[PDB]
């Protein structure tokens, strides 16, 4: 068993920026890691390709994963619309942590965020399931288009994504 690695190719108003790859901790949170892995390959017939990062707050995080409404209100899991908080073993310890957005206990869908700082106030409330493995410099580049209120100044999209390993 080896944890899966998936990648996103990021574009800024259609111009390629670069590739970010992620290691998913399927050994600790198998169900949450599976959900993100299948949405990155698009194998259930829907997923992250073509979707955008709709909320980026510099020094905090980049949020995305709404492939239905595209505006921060949608997305769904591969298990139905929402699923349970699998566990909170891992914490939001620094830059590069991959975690699930939600609207309270047991409401995980497809929306996720990549932390650019330690955000310990989300520990025990948001399930951590991966980390940036390569491409942290592309995540830093993405922050330049965010704002204190979250609106981005450019359209940041997942031009392509898939599983590497």
């Amino acid at each position: 068993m080896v944890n899966p690695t998936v990648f996103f190719d990021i574009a800024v108003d259609g111009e390629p920026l670069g590739r970010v790859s992620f290691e998913l901790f399927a050994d600790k949170v198998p169900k949450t890691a599976e959900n993100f892995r299948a949405l990155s390959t698009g194998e259930k017939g829907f997923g992250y390709k073509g979707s955008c990062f709709h909320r980026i707050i510099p020094g905090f995080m980049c949020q995305g994963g709404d492939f239905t409404r595209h505006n921060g209100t949608g997305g769904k899991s591969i298990y139905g619309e929402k699923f349970e908080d699998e566990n909170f073993i891992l914490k939001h310890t620094g830059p590069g942590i991959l975690s699930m957005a939600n609207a309270g206990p047991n409401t995980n869908g497809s929306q996720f965020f990549i932390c650019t700082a330690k955000t310990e106030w989300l520990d025990g409330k948001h399930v951590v399931f991966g980390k940036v493995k390569e491409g942290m410099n592309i995540v830093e580049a993405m922050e330049r288009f965010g704002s204190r209120n979250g609106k981005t100044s450019k359209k940041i999209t997942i031009a392509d994504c898939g599983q590497l390993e």
């Binding site: 909320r55 995080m61 949020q63 209100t73 939600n102 609207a103």
Partner: peptide
């Protein structure tokens, strides 16, 4: 504030 929610985004 600094939350990451889906639906009602708070301060």
């Amino acid at each position: 504030x600094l939350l990451v929610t889906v639906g009602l985004v708070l301060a």
